């Protein structure tokens, strides 16, 4: 009563699970995604070592097919051909995945939310939501053997957007993948090299949506009494680790239903930027940029986009 | 510093 | 530390659209039996429901059960507790190896949020000490399954969403019809006990911090189990349950649980701005099992 | 006060 509750969720993993396969080359084992007659997986599966600079050219030319082993739930598929594209391999198999969902391939942009199906040994073990950050990394949860874990989005009509294959954990702990065309996000290298990412920026659009969710759930203590216009805030955001706000009218639905303007939520962001002190906001102890406007509206009112 | 998963 | 859910695939194939008259919510399809919240037959929403009267005046041809738009044939309906068991002609060929379990406070499980018999979201949650959970549900969410998947692959069905209390807290029933914490599936004024911090989880959380190089918060002070238990009395925390389980991780830190017990007191006061694994306050969202599994794959 | 979903 007086709210619905804001909870971080992933979209259902079912249709993606039926595409996850166990891909083994030699003694190296990771995950692949099985669509049609093709299995896509990180190319470093054929690397004789993963803990040393890899000569991928040499790796592919000395590759032998009989060292490949592709299985789905322990049922082995027959490797027919292997081709290299960017940072991934496309493995042609005899059997075609009869559970291939209506799908497309999309490349994510900073600010996009998607879902991770964390897999090990070709078996999905966990599923969770993440945002592609401004520095083209994500804050996931992975350990050894996670690579090949698919990232995805499910459209309203049911089309699965495949957009991520886990590949790298940077020294900072930040995670990086490639799209299904081989492009490593943010132009990172699929090498165990020292790679540094840009400092992360707070997704200001998300924080605004979050604060609206907080209001719609009865949380009001943080509300600032002052207003700050869009240009005034963007000049502040560049200098305090926040993105620009785009674009004070997509929030017209929640501005209407709460009676609080975006400008009043922008001045609050400034004040709350410091910290929450002792207080709370919907269980979160600092400003939260994890939820998009779409996610919020979906959980509040049940509509999409 | 980075590692391949 | 990331809150995640176990894969929902096997559960999705059991979710069905259950409609009575024009009322639509979710059901779980196992074998030839569909289980759903009984309030699907309730004539009104803003009024105390006479379920006995609703059930005797119930008529079967008003039911419409579907899986992905494919209609099943209703054969029988039985009321047990706060749920209905709808017997159907067709048997679910995708019935997973399953059992029915009733959760205890502190247990983590997974919610498959469903609307119109189609899953729209999945997430991990904890059953609180007051037998509620903090999820996110709106119109048509009832019947949403809660579950855990055992290591051998057995699916434990343990939750069917039913009600949101005035406090915002969410409540469901088990598959036997028993509503958790003995709440009523009625729109009455029902108030739950104040929530307690799951201290077992907080301790596990702090061990996780130690394992990630976060050590600043470590107190130089010691506090025994009983001394902490009645610090817990006055600050909304559970009793610590109960020292002997943390002997493995106590070593990699050189930190006793007692040294993990006194810091909670000091940090309860406040963090002074600083964080612990991104959190600016104590976190009881993660169990010890979740921690170990995410750390080491166990 | 309680609301059945």
Numbering used by the authors:
A (entry chain B): -2 to 302
B (entry chain D), D (entry chain E): 1 to 5
C (entry chain A): 3 to 300
What does the paper behind this entry write?
Here, we report the crystal structure of HCoV-NL63 Mpro in complex with a synthetic peptidomimetic inhibitor, N3. The two molecules form a typical homodimer, which has been observed in the crystal structures of other CoV Mpros485253. Domain I (residues 8–100) and domain II (residues 101–183) together form a chymotrypsin-like fold, and the substrate-binding site is located in a cleft formed between domain I and domain II. Cβ of vinyl group on inhibitor N3 forms a standard 1.8 Å covalent bond with the Sγ atom of Cys144, as evidenced by clear electron density. The carbonyl oxygen of ester on N3 is very close to the backbone NH of Gly142 and the backbone of NH of Cys144, which mimics the tetrahedral oxyanion intermediate state formed during serine protease cleavage and provides additional support to anchor the Michael acceptor. In our enzyme-inhibitor complex structure, the lactam ring of N3 molecule serves as a structural analog to glutamine or histidine at P1 position, and protrudes into the S1 pocket by forming a 2.5 Å hydrogen bond between the lactam oxygen and the imidazole ring NH of His163, which is similar to those in the complex structures of SARS-CoV Mpro and HCoV-HKU1 Mpro with inhibitor N34953. As observed in the HCoV-NL63 structure with N3, the aliphatic isobutyl side chain of P2 protrudes into the deep S2 pocket via interactions with the alkyl portion of the side chains of Asp187, Pro189, and is well accommodated onto the Van der Waals surface of the pocket. The crystal structure of HCoV-NL63 Mpro shows that the size of its S1 pocket is comparable to that of HCoV-HKU1, but smaller than those of HCoV-229E and SARS-CoV.
The 5′ two-thirds of coronaviral genome is consisted of open reading frame 1 (ORF1), which encodes two large polypeptides of the replicase machinery: pp1a, and through ribosomal frameshift, pp1ab18. These two polypeptides are cotranslationally cleaved into mature nonstructural proteins (Nsps) through two proteases encoded in the 5′ region of ORF1: papain-like protease (PLP) and 3C-like protease (3CL or Nsp5). 3CL protease is more commonly known as Mpro because of its dominant role in the posttranslational processing of the replicase polyprotein. The Mpros from different human and animal CoVs are known to share significant homology in both primary amino acid sequence and 3D architecture, providing a strong structural basis for designing wide-spectrum anti-CoV inhibitors4849.
